[PDB]
């Protein structure tokens, strides 16, 4: 919640940030565990222990079957775009529950 999509403009080194009210952010949950599970590999980029800290969201990446630096026929390629996801502009809030 309280999504804010900002647009950066850099003309002649002079950088400036403005709101882009019409821009959206996409969010979805791998409810069916169809993506390679990255959590629980003791990765950095969790919520900071201190409430006051503002953190950067970690980038998602994954690994399939490999033979050296090559990929075998089994190796899987996943496109997250090929998942239904909610779209939200500022003023839109996402949420879900888990058991």
């Amino acid at each position: 919640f309280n999504i804010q999509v900002k647009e950066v403009t850099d003309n002649n080194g002079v950088k400036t940030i403005a709101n882009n009210l019409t821009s959206t952010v996409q969010v979805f949950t791998d409810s069916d565990y169809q993506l390679p599970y990255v959590l629980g590999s003791a990765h950095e980029g969790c919520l900071p222990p201190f409430p006051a800290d503002v953190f950067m969201i970690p980038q998602y990446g994954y690994l399939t079957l490999n033979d050296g630096s090559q990929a075998v026929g089994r190796s899987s390629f996943y496109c997250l775009e090929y998942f239904p996801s909610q779209m939200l502009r500022t003023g839109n809030n996402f949420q879900f529950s888990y058991e």
């Binding site: 019409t22 959206t24 996409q26 090929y82 939200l88 500022t90 839109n92």
Partner: protein
């Protein structure tokens, strides 16, 4: 339904129910202004003969 509200979601999946398949695709497009807001007559003549 306002400047600050999404007007659709990214729904993109294929589901098979047996005898039927449902494909749903979402893409993000860009639309320039074509022809300077003009309707222009064209021919192999305006194309440099042929």
């Amino acid at each position: 339904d306002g400047v600050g509200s999404s007007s659709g979601n990214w729904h993109c999946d294929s589901q098979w129910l047996g005898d039927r398949v449902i494909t749903t695709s979402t893409r993000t497009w860009a639309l320039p202004t074509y022809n300077n807001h003009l309707y222009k007559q064209i021919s192999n003549s305006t194309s440099g003969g042929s």
